Design a protein around this ligand. Structure first.
Ligand code: NA
Lengths: 380, 380
C-alpha cells in the first residue's frame, strides 16, 4: 500500500497551512514534526498535532462540479511539516502529484520540478482523540470568532497559574458565559445558545487554542459544531476538525468581582477616549510602570494625564457625553484600557467606577452581552 | 524661553519620519538620540544623525498659496527623537504648536492635547558638513534608487576589511561605475551621467548609508544633486539633505576576477531560472551552507538540483533558449544566485561559466551595464 494521488495545488496549500498551526518546532514526540496525509476513495486528509491541539483538514475528491483530487492508490504517509509546507507553496503548476515509493521515500511533482522527501510510517502517528460526537453545541462561525476576539486577549500569559491561561466557557440554562482574566483585568462575553436548558458545562479552553482556531475559520455564518467532553473540546466546521485539550482544575469565581452598582458613570465617544488614552501612553519607559490618570467631574469634564520623569508629561481634556455621580481621580494601565476599548464596537462607551481603588467596568451603552473590567493602580 | 511656531501636522510627521532614519538607538554621543529643530524666518529644519549619516529635512513657511508654518519666534531645540516621532504621529488636529519655554522644557500642543518634553540645548548638536557649493553631479531619482538596489546587497557585512562594506563609486568620462563585493560575489553597475567629461571621482560609500538614502527617495525622476568631497558625500533632493561619511582607503581592483574567456554560455528565461533555484534552495538544514548544483549540456535541458541528506532532494529541468560550449556541472550558493537574479530586469539572462572552479557571470543579453559575478562552491 503505497499512497499515490494528483491534487490541485491551491487546495493542497490551503489544507497544509491550516494544519501547520498545530505543528510545534519544540516537540518531545519526534513524529509530531510531521504532517500525516491519508488518501482514501473519498478524498485526502491532512493532520497536524502538538498533543494539545490537533487539526485535521479534508479535501474531497470532487467539490461543486470540479474534480479536485484523483486518487490512484489509497494510502498514508507522514512528511516533515515545515519542508512540505515550504515546497507546496512554490510548486510551478496548478496540478501536483504525490507518490510514496519504497522505504517511505515520497515524490512530490509539479511541472518539471520533482522533490523527494524522506517519509515516515503513518501507523506511528498518534490517533486523534476519541470523543463521543454527541450533545454538540452549534454556534455561527462569525459569532464564535467574535466571542474569541472579545475575550482571549485577557488571559494570562504566565504559566505560574495555568488555569488563567485559558478562557472559561460556562454553559447553563442555554446561555454561554466566556470569562478570561489575568488577575489584573477581565473580559466577559455572554451568548444565548440553542440547546436544551438542562445541559451544563464548565470548562477552560487554552487561549492559544482559540486564537489558532479563529485563524482557520472563515468570515461566514455557517454553524460550527462544538463537542465538549471532560478533557477535550472538538470544533467541527466545513472540511475541518479542530481538537483542543482542556485545562484541568476549577476556574476561579469572578462573579463577586463584577460590581453591580457604581458611584460615577461616564458616557464618552469611544474613538475620542481611545485616542486620548493612546496619547497618554506615549511617554512610557522600560523599567518603569506606565500609569495614566483620569479625573472626572459632572457634568462633562474629563482630564487624562501621565508623567515620565526626565522624559516629559502629557495632559488632555476630553468633553464627555454624560458624567453622573461622584468626582473621581483614578489611575490605571493604559495597555489594559486600550485592549478593552479595541474589542468594544459602539460609537460610545459607558465607564462605571466605584472610587479609585475598586475595579471599574467598561461597557457599550444598552448592551448587557460584553463586560470589560480593569483593576486600577493604587496611588499614595 | 525661545523657539515658537505653528505647523501643519502632515508635513511635520513627514519630516520627522525622514530624519528618524539617521537616528541610532545605540549611539555613544548622547545628544544624537535627539532631533534638532531650527526655526528661522524662512521655515523650520529638522536634523537627525548617527555621526556617519546625517539627514536634514526643511519645511518652508510657504508653498504657493498654502501657509505650512507660522514662526512666532525663531530659535532651536533638541528633542528626543523616538518620543517626538511617536507624539507627532498621534496629535489630534491638523495644526501643531511647538513652544520652547525656560529650562528647555518644550510644549507640543494640538487641539486640547498638550505634551511637555525635556529639551536639550541645540548648540551642543554637532554641525553638518559645509559642502553645498562644490561641483555637483546629477542623477534622476529612479536611476539612483535602481543603481543602489542593484549593488548594495553585495557589500561585505564583515568588519575585517572595512572598505568592502561600501560601494565603490568611480566617475570618469561622464559615466558612473558602481562596484560592490564581499569576496564571494560581486555587483557591477554602469550608468551614463549628463555631466562634463573632465569630472573625475573615486570614493567608497557605506552600504548602510545608501540603503537609508533610498528609503527617503520617492518613485519619481527628479534630479538628485550629488556633491562628492574627500570625506563626505551629500545627496540633495527637494527639501532634503542627506550626508554620508565616505570610507578611507584604496578599493581593490576586481577586473582580474572576471575570467578572460568563458567555456559554457547559457541564455535562459530569468523568472523560470529564479523560480527553479528558489525551489532548489528549500531543503536547507541549519547550520549547513545551502548548495545548489547546475548541470548544462548543449541541445537541452538544464538540470538544477540539491540534496539534503536525511531530508530529501530536488531536481528540476529548465528549457534554455540557448546553450553553447562545454558540458558543465557547477555548484553554488543559492543565496548569492537569488540575490543576483532578483536585481535583473530583463526577460532573459546570459550566464557565462569557465568550468566549475572559476567565477561565473550573470548579465542581460546584449548589455554590459549590469554585471553580477559569483564564485562557485569548491567540491573535492
Ligand atoms: Na516623503
Amino acid at each position: 500500500s503505497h499512497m499515490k494521488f494528483t491534487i490541485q495545488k491551491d487546495r493542497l496549500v490551503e489544507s497544509v497551512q491550516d494544519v501547520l498551526k498545530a505543528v510545534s518546532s519544540r516537540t518531545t514526540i519526534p513524529i509530531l514534526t510531521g504532517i500525516k496525509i491519508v488518501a482514501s476513495d473519498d478524498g485526502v486528509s491532512f493532520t497536524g498535532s502538538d498533543s494539545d491541539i490537533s487539526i485535521e483538514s479534508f479535501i474531497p475528491k470532487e467539490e461543486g462540479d470540479k474534480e479536485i483530487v484523483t486518487i490512484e492508490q489509497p494510502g498514508s504517509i507522514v512528511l516533515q511539516a515545515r519542508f512540505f509546507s515550504e515546497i507546496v507553496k512554490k510548486l510551478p503548476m496548478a496540478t501536483v502529484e504525490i507518490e510514496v515509493q519504497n522505504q517511505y521515500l515520497t515524490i512530490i511533482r509539479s511541472g518539471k520540478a520533482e522533490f523527494n522527501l524522506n517519509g515516515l510510517d503513518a501507523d506511528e502517528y498518534p490517533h486523534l482523540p476519541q470523543i463521543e460526537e454527541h450533545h454538540a453545541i452549534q454556534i455561527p462561525t462569525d459569532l464564535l470568532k467574535n466571542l474569541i476576539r472579545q475575550t482571549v486577549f485577557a488571559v494570562s500569559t504566565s504559566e505560574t497559574r495555568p488555569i488563567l491561561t485559558g478562557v472559561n466557557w460556562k454553559v447553563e440554562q442555554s446561555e454561554l458565559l466566556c470569562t478570561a482574566t489575568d488577575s489584573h483585568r477581565l473580559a466577559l462575553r455572554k451568548a444565548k445558545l440553542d440547546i436544551p436548558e438542562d445541559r451544563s458545562y464548565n470548562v477552560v479552553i487554552p487561549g492559544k487554542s482559540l486564537t489558532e482556531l479563529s485563524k482557520i475559520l472563515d468570515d461566514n455564518q455557517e454553524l460550527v459544531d462544538i463537542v465538549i467532553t471532560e478533557t477535550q473540546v472538538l470544533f467541527k466546521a466545513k472540511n475541518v476538525l479542530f481538537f483542543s485539550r482542556l485545562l484541568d482544575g476549577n476556574y476561579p469565581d469572578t462573579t463577586s468581582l463584577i460590581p453591580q452598582d457604581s458611584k460615577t458613570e461616564i458616557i464618552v465617544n469611544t474613538k475620542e477616549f481611545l485616542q486620548a488614552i493612546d496619547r497618554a501612553s506615549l511617554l512610557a519607559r522600560e523599567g518603569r510602570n506606565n500609569v495614566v490618570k483620569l479625573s472626572a467631574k459632572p457634568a462633562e469634564s474629563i482630564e487624562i494625564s501621565s508623567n515620565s520623569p526626565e522624559i516629559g508629561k502629557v495632559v488632555e481634556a476630553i468633553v464627555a457625553d454624560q458624567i453622573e455621580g461622584e468626582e473621581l481621580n483614578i489611575s490605571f494601565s493604559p495597555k489594559y484600557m486600550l485592549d478593552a476599548l479595541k474589542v468594544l464596537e459602539g460609537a460610545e462607551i459607558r465607564v462605571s467606577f466605584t472610587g479609585a481603588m475598586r475595579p471599574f467596568l467598561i461597557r457599550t451603552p444598552n448592551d448587557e452581552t460584553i463586560v470589560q473590567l480593569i483593576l486600577p493602580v493604587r496611588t499614595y
